[PDB]
């Protein structure tokens, strides 16, 4: 019942969709560069509201906020974020659907706003258990805290 | 009896084929940039159905699906994916035929959809055995599970 899609510099001609709840939500491709309006377009920040303003129209029952970040999808008590994929168009380094479960400490979202926790799972390279981090911030830092339940 | 070809940003003038069952299947080269239709073309996502729609025409007995991903080739009980290579045109970082056997944890496909297992073989750098991972997701994470048979 929350979790987030960080945006990083969408280049030209890449259809970005968000596949929450099975439906194709937040459809946009960054248009082909002929140049002047397109170079202001290729940033992540203008997309960060352009992707989000369509998700305020579609399924439509919960509120969206973005900071430098992400797109902080968060549902009410009835619905959840099952089948959460988000197509990239370019390689994986374009945008990422990142959730409450990362597979390493290095693969971790930059902002992920203050009330947020990740179950870091083992890297399968060290003999490590599965600790949790909980960004807290006021200061951009991933600590280590208690389990959620 | 499954396994997958991740696509990452095919640049201009690179013939991509998929060599399943010996035959040259899914032939396309990304056309030379003169510019406007070609910059929408150079993405991985438009290729992800363009490569797959030819494999729905050729050998033709099994269904294809793609998510953000890959091309999830999966055969029926009679046929298998023997001689599975997939030409890249650019370097190895363009597209990769990746199967149920990786040689390290770092060399591992990003999505590889939920019902999928990899035999991680030893890196020949540590004194390590050959453990299996089994992506499970709902959460983009490679765990460690039981053997298949």
Curated annotation (Swiss-Prot), chains A, B:
It comes from the Viruses. It is found in: Virion. Interacts with head-to-tail connector protein gp8, the tail component gp11, and the fiber protein gp17. Structural component of the short non-contractile tail. The tail complex is involved in viral genome delivery. Forms the end of the tail, including the canonical tube, the nozzle, and the small extensions below the fibers. Once the tail tubular structure is formed, the interface between gp11 and gp12 generates the proper environment to interact with the six gp17 trimers. This is Tail tubular protein gp12. It comes from Escherichia phage T7. The lineage of its organism: Viruses, Duplodnaviria, Heunggongvirae, Uroviricota, Caudoviricetes.
